[PDB]
Amino acid sequence: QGGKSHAKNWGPKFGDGEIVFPGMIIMRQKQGIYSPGYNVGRGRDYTIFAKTVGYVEYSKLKTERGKTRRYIHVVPINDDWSPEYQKLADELVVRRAEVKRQILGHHVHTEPAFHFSLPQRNGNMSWLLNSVHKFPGTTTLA
Amino acid sequence: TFSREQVFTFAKNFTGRARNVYKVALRRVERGLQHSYVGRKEKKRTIRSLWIQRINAGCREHGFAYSALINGLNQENIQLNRKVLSELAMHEPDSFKAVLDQVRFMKGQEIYANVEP
Amino acid sequence: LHKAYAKKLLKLGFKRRFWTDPDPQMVPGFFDPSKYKPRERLNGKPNLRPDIGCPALRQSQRPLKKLPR
Amino acid sequence: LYDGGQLGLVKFPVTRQIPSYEVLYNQLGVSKLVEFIQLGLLDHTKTITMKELLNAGCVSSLKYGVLLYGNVSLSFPINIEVTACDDRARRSIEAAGGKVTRVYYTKDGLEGLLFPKRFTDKNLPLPRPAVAWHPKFDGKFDAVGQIPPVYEAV
Amino acid sequence: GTIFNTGVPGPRPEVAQKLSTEYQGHILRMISLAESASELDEVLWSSKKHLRPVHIARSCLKLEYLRTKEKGREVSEPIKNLASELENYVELYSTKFTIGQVSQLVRGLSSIRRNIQPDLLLKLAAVVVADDGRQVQLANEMDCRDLFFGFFSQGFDNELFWKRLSESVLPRLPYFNADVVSTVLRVVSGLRFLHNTEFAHATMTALVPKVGDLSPARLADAFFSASLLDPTDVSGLNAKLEERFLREFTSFPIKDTVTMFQTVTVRRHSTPELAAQVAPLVAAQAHQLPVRHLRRALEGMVTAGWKDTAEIPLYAILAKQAARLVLGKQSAATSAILGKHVDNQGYQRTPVQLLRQLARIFANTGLKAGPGANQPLAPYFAALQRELEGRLAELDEQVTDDFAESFKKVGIAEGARVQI
Amino acid sequence: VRTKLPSKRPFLQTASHLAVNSLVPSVRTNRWADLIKGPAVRSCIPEIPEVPKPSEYTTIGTIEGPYTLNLERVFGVVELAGSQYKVTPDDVIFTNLLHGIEVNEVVMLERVMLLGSRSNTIIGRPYIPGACVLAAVEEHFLDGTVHVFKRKKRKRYRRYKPTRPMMTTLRILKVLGIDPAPGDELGIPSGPVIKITNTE
RNA sequence: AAUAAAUAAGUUUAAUACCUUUUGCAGCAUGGACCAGCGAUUAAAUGCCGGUAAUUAGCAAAGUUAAACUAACGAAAAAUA
RNA sequence: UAAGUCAGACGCAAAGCUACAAGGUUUCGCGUCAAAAGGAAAAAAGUCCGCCAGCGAGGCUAAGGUACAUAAA
RNA sequence: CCUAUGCAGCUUUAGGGCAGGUUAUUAUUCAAUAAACUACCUUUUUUCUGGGACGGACGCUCUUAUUAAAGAAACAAGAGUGAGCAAUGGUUUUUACUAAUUAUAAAAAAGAAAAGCUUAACUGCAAUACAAACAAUUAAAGCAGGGGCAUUGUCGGCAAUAAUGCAUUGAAGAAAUA
RNA sequence: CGUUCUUCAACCAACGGAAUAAAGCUACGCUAGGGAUAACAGGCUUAUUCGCUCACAGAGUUUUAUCGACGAGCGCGGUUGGCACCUC
Ligand SMILES: [K+]
Ligand SMILES: [K+]
Ligand SMILES: [K+]
Ligand SMILES: [K+]
Ligand SMILES: [Mg+2]
Ligand SMILES: [Mg+2]
Ligand SMILES: [Mg+2]
Ligand SMILES: [Mg+2]
Ligand SMILES: [Mg+2]
Ligand SMILES: [Mg+2]
Ligand SMILES: [Mg+2]
Ligand SMILES: [Mg+2]
Ligand SMILES: [Mg+2]
Ligand SMILES: [Mg+2]
Ligand SMILES: [Mg+2]
Ligand SMILES: [Mg+2]
Ligand SMILES: [Mg+2]
Ligand SMILES: [Mg+2]
Ligand SMILES: [Mg+2]
Ligand SMILES: [Mg+2]
Ligand SMILES: [Mg+2]
Ligand SMILES: [Mg+2]
């Protein structure tokens, strides 16, 4: 009788000259109207995300067969295309987290603090429990 | 809420049960006090209307108009208000006429501190 | 847990630290043979009966049923 | 607390893991033990037992035992007897030349250790020590505690 | 992410494993993991009713770490206010601290250039020296090291305080590490009344077999102190220190090499090592050489007698480096940002005393600045004129004459600005 | 966008610009608009001068004892306490509260706008220089209570606030500036004995 | 809705009660004939968040209960010698 | 504020449904009422002007008016 | 007449029970058990809706009008779906090819078909974002291990937009305790 | 006997699903509420109904005597409807 499907927000998220950081989504689309340019990626559903620190750019290209192609680019900070820019981006990522924590305040906790320690699997932290809970280092051999 | 003493002090001149019956008088007292707030505001509008009518009547006896007088006073830099002008027309006809002649004809003799410079 | 829900729990006195409670019988040297009870499985079914259930899981109290006679 | 009928709080799974029994012990840090010794509330020239810790004020109320943990940089030896200990504390004390011993006490034995006067004033014999601990606890204790501890020089 | 609300950074596994544990000490970890002055203030404010002397000692020590992060500038307002509040707790617990806690407290407050009140500083000193220092025996090497340097930086010059402290520490000197002994030697040199005491000789003798364990920074400081303390080299430390420097000339950082090189030159032991000394300076000149070390390099090279060479104009680059530091100009190049060049830290006003010393040293170098269009000393004096123009209030009759003498010596006396 | 939750986009953009500025120095170091910014001024036009007015009222002495007044044949208009009055000797006027005067004191009023008699009239434009009116301060009183009441039907709103205004009373003694018409002169003593206590 | 603001005392102008309930009530929507007296968020235990103090608290009377605290990276070198 | 609210109404301007009807109904942009006294149009919730701390027989204006009722050519 | 945390009486092949009689089985010299028949006891019998009943509908996708940012309702309108594929997945080579889907101007260094080898339709983690009352739902650089095809690139299922179900209870494989 | 990991299944399609399961009558009816909601009357609307004007085609056959139409506009509030504004 009635009914409606849940809305999908297709469209761009950033314009020309806006700053982005790695992992941020730039475009949500149903079909490949826009193609990935430099310093970007594409998901299996045609979602375009940034892979470096820089500013968003838009460009159009005319192909050999007379079709029009549209790209999305991310430009480095000072137009630096050298391979040394990657390490600068890594430092900027660490700095950005520090800025956010300072603005938020101490009472917006970003890590858990339980009365027990989480198990370790394959050298990383795991959220799955072990069959038995034991204090670390409170037992001797045999 | 007003007390019994306050209610009956206000309602001492009311008619019938409104004088000594608390429920009847209390509603009559509150409505009357509401009338007073509106009355004080309207008094200021009514009195100014009366001043203008008296001024206009005096002006037309000589062949003039109220609106012509108000404009004429401002050109001469005379700042007499309507309350004073209304009283002049009623009780001081000669002084009221002198003001009109100065505005219309400007034939008054000027006065200086040093009569003989 | 969402901030609005968490404050209500804290306001009511929720202070649990572990998923379950420790067993004093497991401390070495403090085993009492008299107070022996086989370990049981914790029940996960909430009491949702609107007559004798938890007041926090029903909107209002319902009248009790009749006894067999 | 009623949310209108959605009952969103009971839509989460249940966990049944049992926490370790050692959460019932009193925890004592190695850095706190040293501070008492430096201030002069503990005698570091003789063996330190849980009775001395209780009287000195390091431990507030003991029902089961004391757990020693943490890292500290020591310059003098210490000989301490506790019920449980981690590996960080053992290395810290032994680095300076000390000795850490885990002692096994029962319910009755622990009372005699802490409050011997409670038995002598009534002319009662002290509780007797245990013979041995269950094999399931192998690797948890080094020796069986004696109700009157044998103090030594350090 | 998925765990927290929009904009909240995700957890760090390293921090998470520290806070999630079966052991107590939550408040100590929170203050130790604070990343800014404001964050630490909030932790103390919300935990006021449970603070203890151990918490106060750590809080004052953290001020040392926060200051290090915020380098390239003086102490900021939030740091100063936080230190002031901590002092009230020090007074409250002044009678409950241990020797170790007092040592940490003084070190932290000293690193921030904070002067403890004389009445409170006296109380802290009394705690350490009470009972003739019999409680000092129950302390580790680090506690003793911070006691000596912490109080020396504060300026406590009580003879009885130092006499008792020296007596108790004397028997333990042979068993301390090389770095600990070097710190003690630095304090002895600064205290005149201990110059010729047996304690100074005992320290020097104890350091003889531990020279090889000294760190590059402590090694440089020990050589400096030993030169002034024992000019006769009776203990043999100077001989051993010089031998190690010769063997490991290129194995030390630039700053340590410059300090050691200057000490050798003033000791009149110069040898034909200038060729080896010049190359490291030019190789690393834009970094590892602040204003103070730049002056030290000039004095050592000038005293040694090295002359400008066509291949390596060391004096020319030093003038450019000096001008860069005075002006404070920064560079946005990726290499400079990643290299953490000192010149990009910003602008830091320098004392006029250093400016006069640098100007005199450049004049004594013997190079011209004005006459030639591109002279080695041109950039420095051009920057000097600009900097002085903005701080005329500090110029007096003596300072003007001192610069005028330097300007005439280099060859600029026409009353005109430098070409560059 | 459909959600009513406030957006955090401005916070996310600010954190990115702050991080870049913190670590990467800028290339430019000056701004011309800042360099030539001039001193702050109050306005760009000359100030408008004010128009002088005669003094409102000033004390000149006190009254010694009981007196009597007779009627005269002159009148005038005087501005006082924000309103104008037509006065003749032996009149009583009521004004707002006047500060700095006491009972049994004589005051001088100089803002005279009109003077008249039975043979001549003088008009000020807007004030007459060289004219004045004398009066005696008789009372500083609180007027009758005025009851102020407000109510809103069906809104549970009611307010009562009685008040008492402050006012001052004066009695006119003499009008100076215009001569009476021939035959209208008052040839006998008229006013009180005044002790002069204001010499400038 | 029986009053108000004024007046030369002749009069003139302004002005559809209150409560409850409603998108909206002079309401042809609800309740009250009037007066006096009586008539409705109180007490205990526990928890959370502010304010004001003590500077651990209770017993006992040189010894015991309750609470609280208890390792995080030992990182500074400011010597015009 | 771990509070109240989750019955809304009309004007101008659009679209769906109805009959390019309804003081109809469903969304949407602005405003007013609700919770807003005072002035103009006859009385005047939603239109036009404009937001009341109190008193006063001072003055200038808005919308709207200027042969009588009714202030002003 | 409609609306309730509604009440009562009555009816039955609506659910459950055996507590009188009858009937069946068994046991001791008025007894015990019950998927039966009669009697009795107790409980249940949605909401939306141009008033209610009758009829119709309830999850999830695409498209139309309210213009060319997103979002936006009615018992408004026009069409799909509660799957399929052991290859129709992954990856290399060749070229007289450039289609089809419920619907649709996707796409040329891309796809389809043909030929070969394969199981990444993995194990343990994850910065940062889209969306969003919450629960859940969506995209994803990167790190370690073992692999596939190439020979230094890609693979954490399928052109994309639907093919789904919380917790509880029950069951299976393995491992750790007691 | 209990715990963890790897996984699946049933009724939940009234599809945020739980008091394990589970149909009706009342005109013999009862209580608590609403003009938040219907039946009679009033109100708004005028599709429909009715009337008039234009239109003069077509029947009568010289006549618009009389009858009378496609189509368009306007009016009425008396026919059949729509809405739910007043009173439970
Ligand atoms: K009565
Ligand atoms: K209807
Ligand atoms: K349902
Ligand atoms: K009715
Ligand atoms: Mg359907
Ligand atoms: Mg007015
Ligand atoms: Mg109604
Ligand atoms: Mg009645
Ligand atoms: Mg509702
Ligand atoms: Mg609603
Ligand atoms: Mg409507
Ligand atoms: Mg309302
Ligand atoms: Mg005017
Ligand atoms: Mg008129
Ligand atoms: Mg219904
Ligand atoms: Mg969420
Ligand atoms: Mg590979
Ligand atoms: Mg794929
Ligand atoms: Mg349900
Ligand atoms: Mg009834
Ligand atoms: Mg209605
Ligand atoms: Mg409606």
Within 8 A by CB and 6+ apart from F42, the residues are none
Contact call for residues F112 and F74 (beta carbons, < 8 A): no
- How many angstroms separate the CA atoms of F118 and E116, rounded? 94
Contact call for residues E267 and E298 (beta carbons, < 8 A): no
Alpha helices for chain F (secondary structure H) = 9-23, 32-35
- How many angstroms separate the CA atoms of B99 and B88, rounded? 10
Contact call for residues E368 and E418 (beta carbons, < 8 A): no
Nearest CA among E232, E228, E257 for reference residue E245: E257
C13 Cα distance to chain centroid: 14
Residue D123, by phi and psi: left (phi above 0), alpha (psi -120 to 50) or beta?
left
Contact call for residues A135 and D83 (beta carbons, < 8 A): no
Contact call for residues A52 and A81 (beta carbons, < 8 A): no
Nearest CA among A100, F24, A113, A93 for reference residue E35: A100
| DSSP codes joined into one string, B83-111 | HHHHHHHHH-HHHHHHHHHHHHH--PPP-
Rounded to 10°, the helix E274-283/E314-327 angle is 40
Residues in reach of strand H, judged by a CB distance below 7 angstroms, are: B 37, 40, 43-44, 47-49, 52-53, 56, 65-68, 70, 81-83; C 4, 7-8, 10-11; F 82-84, 146, 148, 150, 152, 155, 157, 161, 163, 165
A112 token code pair: 């858990």
Going across the sheet that includes F83-87, the strands are F83-87, F75-80, F112-116, F121-123
CA torsion angle B37 B40 B46 B48 (round to 10): -140
Cα angle value A108/A114/A116 (rounded, 5°): 160
Strands F105-109 and F132-142: antiparallel
C-alpha separations of E315 from A33, D58, E297, E371, F59 in Å: 62, 66, 10, 17, 89
Strands A120-121 and A68-75: unpaired
Q: Are chains F and D in contact at 3+ CB pairs closer than 8 Å?
A: no
- How many angstroms separate the CA atoms of E328 and E171, rounded? 50
Q: What is the DSSP letter of D46?
A: B
- How many angstroms separate the CA atoms of A29 and A70, rounded? 13
F160 token code pair: 């009562």
Residues in chain D: 154
3-state secondary structure chain A: CCCCCCCCCCEECCCCCCEECCCCEEEECCCCCCEECCCEEECCCCCEEECCCEEEEEEEEECCCCCEEEEEEEECCCCCCCCCHHHHHHHHHHHHHHHHHHHHCCCCCCCCCCCCCCCEECCEECCCCCCCCCCCCCCCCC
Cα angle value F13/F18/F21 (rounded, 5°): 130
Contact call for residues E166 and E199 (beta carbons, < 8 A): yes
Contact call for residues E125 and E158 (beta carbons, < 8 A): yes
Resolution in angstrom units = 3.2
Cα angle value B14/B17/B21 (rounded, 5°): 100
Residues in chain A: 142
Q: Which helix (H) or strand (E) holds F160?
A: strand F157-160
Long-range (24+ apart) CB contacts under 8 A made by D87-96 are: D87/A137, D88/A137, D88/D30, D89/D30, D92/D30, D93/D30
- How many angstroms separate the CA atoms of D142 and D100, rounded? 10
Nearest CA among E131, E136, E134, E130 for reference residue E99: E136
Q: Which helix (H) or strand (E) holds C4?
A: helix C3-12
Method: cryo-EM
- How many angstroms separate the CA atoms of E323 and E316, rounded? 11
Residue with structure tokens 């409050």?
D115
> How many CB atoms within 10 Å of residue D101?
15
Query: How far does the centroid of ligand 5 lie from the alpha carbon of residue A1, in Å?
Result: 8
Q: What is the DSSP letter of B10?
A: H
A25 token code pair: 């989504």
C-alpha separations of E13 from A111, A123, A129 in Å: 8, 11, 17
Interface of B with F in 10-39 (CB under 8 A): 30, 33-34, 36-37
Within 8 A by CB and 6+ apart from D41, the residues are D56, D57
Instruction: Return positions of chain J under 7 A from a protein CB.
Output: 1-6, 16-20
Q: Which helix (H) or strand (E) holds F140?
A: strand F132-142
Nearest CA among E161, E206, E198 for reference residue E182: E206
C-alpha separations of D61 from D50, D114, D127 in Å: 11, 11, 20
Contact call for residues D139 and A141 (beta carbons, < 8 A): yes
What are residue D26's DSSP bridge partners?
A: D66
* Backbone φ, ψ for residue F55 (5° rounding): -65, 145
CA neighbours closer than 13 Å in the CB half-sphere of residue E59: 28
Going across the sheet that includes A11-12, the strands are A11-12, A25-28, A48-50, A40-42
Nearest CA among E23, D105, E308, E112 for reference residue A114: E23
3-state secondary structure F106-134: EEEECCEEEEECCCCEEECCCCCCCCEEE
> How many CB atoms within 10 Å of residue D96?
14
Contact call for residues D60 and D26 (beta carbons, < 8 A): yes
Contact call for residues A39 and A19 (beta carbons, < 8 A): no
Which nucleotide does the CA of C11 lie closest to, via C1'?
G48
Residue with structure tokens 């020693």?
D68
Instruction: Return positions of chain H under 7 A from a protein CB.
Output: 2, 35-36, 53-60, 71-73
A99 token code pair: 């800025």
* Backbone φ, ψ for residue E121 (5° rounding): -60, -35
Residue type, E53: P
> How many CB atoms within 10 Å of residue E385?
14
CA torsion angle F184 F185 F189 F194 (round to 10): 110
C-alpha separations of F199 from A66, E305, F61, F195 in Å: 106, 94, 10, 12
E48 token code pair: 């006021």
Going across the sheet that includes A68-75, the strands are A19-20, A54-62, A68-75, A35-36
Contact call for residues A106 and E43 (beta carbons, < 8 A): yes
CA neighbours closer than 13 Å in the CB half-sphere of residue E180: 17
The answer to whether B28 CB is within 7 Å of strand G is yes
A28 token code pair: 């949500």
B56 token code pair: 């206009």
With b meaning 16 or more CB within 10 Å and e meaning fewer, what string describes E369-378?
bbeeeebbbb
Contact call for residues A122 and E24 (beta carbons, < 8 A): no
* Backbone φ, ψ for residue C45 (5° rounding): -95, 115
E201 Cα distance to chain centroid: 26
The answer to whether D146 CB is within 7 Å of strand G is no
Q: Which chains touch E (3 or more CB pairs under 8 A)?
A: A, D, F
Within 8 A by CB and 6+ apart from B72, the residues are B103, B104
Q: Which chains touch A (3 or more CB pairs under 8 A)?
A: C, D, E, F
Omega before E171 within 30 of 0, i.e. cis: no
What is the number of CB-based contacts under 8 A between chain E and chain F?
A: 16
D4 token code pair: 């209108």
E125 Cα distance to chain centroid: 25
Nearest CA among D81, D67, D96, D95 for reference residue E138: D96
Residue type, E64: E
Q: What is the DSSP letter of E132?
A: G
Determine the distance between C44 (CA) and I14 (C1') in angstroms.
32
Residue with structure tokens 């319910």?
D107
Within 8 A by CB and 6+ apart from B97, the residues are B62
Residue B85, by phi and psi: left (phi above 0), alpha (psi -120 to 50) or beta?
alpha
- How many angstroms separate the CA atoms of E135 and E102, rounded? 13
With b meaning 16 or more CB within 10 Å and e meaning fewer, what string describes F101-135?
eeeebbbbbbbbbbbbbbeebbbbebbbeebbbbb
E350 token code pair: 């320098």
Residue with structure tokens 């304090």?
E187
Nearest CA among E21, E96, E12, E19 for reference residue E55: E96
Contact call for residues F180 and F54 (beta carbons, < 8 A): no
Q: What is the DSSP letter of F6?
A: P
The answer to whether C45 CB is within 7 Å of strand I is yes
* Backbone φ, ψ for residue A56 (5° rounding): -80, 145
3-state secondary structure (DSSP) of residue F92? strand
CA torsion angle C22 C25 C28 C33 (round to 10): 180
- How many angstroms separate the CA atoms of F134 and F74, rounded? 14
Alpha helices for E112-236 (secondary structure H) = 118-129, 141-154, 159-169, 178-190, 198-207, 216-229
Number of alpha helices (DSSP H) and beta strands (DSSP E) in chain C: 1, 0
C-alpha separations of E190 from D93, E112, E152, E195, E226 in Å: 37, 20, 8, 8, 12
What is the number of CB-based contacts under 8 A between chain A and chain C?
A: 4
B20 token code pair: 């000594």
Nearest CA among B94, B98, B48 for reference residue B78: B98
3-state secondary structure (DSSP) of residue C43? coil
Q: How far apart are the first and last CA of chain C?
A: 48
C-alpha separations of A81 from B76, E22, E83 in Å: 83, 49, 46
The answer to whether E153 CB is within 7 Å of strand G is yes
Residues in chain F: 200
Long-range (24+ apart) CB contacts under 8 A made by A86-94 are: A86/A52, A87/E338, A88/A53, A88/E334, A88/E337, A88/E338, A89/A22, A89/A52, A89/A53, A91/E338, A91/F23, A92/A21, A92/A53, A92/F19, A92/F20, A92/F23, A93/A21, A93/A22, A93/A53
Residue with structure tokens 């803002």?
F111
Alpha helices for E72-140 (secondary structure H) = 77-92, 99-111, 118-129
Residues of D in contact with A137 (CB under 8 A): 86-88
